[PDB]
Design a protein around this ligand. Sequence first.
Ligand SMILES: [K+]
Ligand SMILES: [K+]
Ligand code: NA
Ligand SMILES: [Zn+2]
Length: 353
Amino acid sequence: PITGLVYDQRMMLHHNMWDSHHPELPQRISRIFSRHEELRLLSRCHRIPARLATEEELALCHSSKHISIIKSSEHMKPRDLNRLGDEYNSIFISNESYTCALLAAGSCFNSAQAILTGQVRNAVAIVRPPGHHAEKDTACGFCFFNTAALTARYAQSITRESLRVLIVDWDVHHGNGTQHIFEEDDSVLYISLHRYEDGAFFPNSEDANYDKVGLGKGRGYNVNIPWNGGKMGDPEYMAAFHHLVMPIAREFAPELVLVSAGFDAARGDPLGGFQVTPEGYAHLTHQLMSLAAGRVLIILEGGYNLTSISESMSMCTSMLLGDSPPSLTPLKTSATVSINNVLRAHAPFWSSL
Ligand SMILES: [K+]
Ligand SMILES: [K+]
Ligand code: NA
Ligand SMILES: [Zn+2]
């Protein structure tokens, strides 16, 4: 049982040149890496090489128009980069952004390939910029290309079209990009847990609500678990996995599990405002390892407290490596209502509920 780890410092090049303190810092991935070194987790892993995604691979999920525009940013001068970035919801762009986006996706491709060919059982990808807000034709919320969505399509490309992929998105924000790409798809099961606040939390859309179960053949295969007022923690997430994520996943019988692993739901994160502990993430990870013969790829999304996310993602790697789960109140009423809402919404599609 081998765990893969992919990390490249070239992904640090992507930066905000008008605010060097912008929360999506280059140092996010470097601090996670060093913590993996420090805890002797890195030395236990099989080092998977990073690579650039090709344009043909980007076309698995993205329009050529979207690809061309972001590609052209590599040759732009600072003010043009400023203007282009302002055409999007919450995006900054540097000359290196396009290349870093390519490495993020290519790294995840190589990890998926390693898992699916049996070189490793599972893998962790310490990458940036993130991906899950990125749409087919647009960039959004610090994301340029949808790394997770692309990896699902890449995985199917190197296996068979009907490879069943589960994408679990435990980043505090709804992965609107991932939901939309696969909304009519029944080969990719998208499950997201996210702070919703009745549509008044980024990315501020009712697409993130529980009632959005998918379209056409894809009905049932989109699971939104929205949190409303207010601070949520380990109890809420554990209960969500127990009643929803793991029962549905088992019935879906995935062959590959991708985790859109943001750690902005972690205690200490300003943008999330939740209190999922590092031990919390370990237990979520451990549960997912019971799926798909352990074929699990952990892909970094959001998470902005450098100490919180280094410790949190390290905890997940420890689990993938096979360490025993660390030792961990009744649910908030609102959380219970959220879970019953999803249960009632997905009753027709999943007989296990
Ligand atoms: K999420
Ligand atoms: K789907
Ligand atoms: Na179903
Ligand atoms: Zn996030």
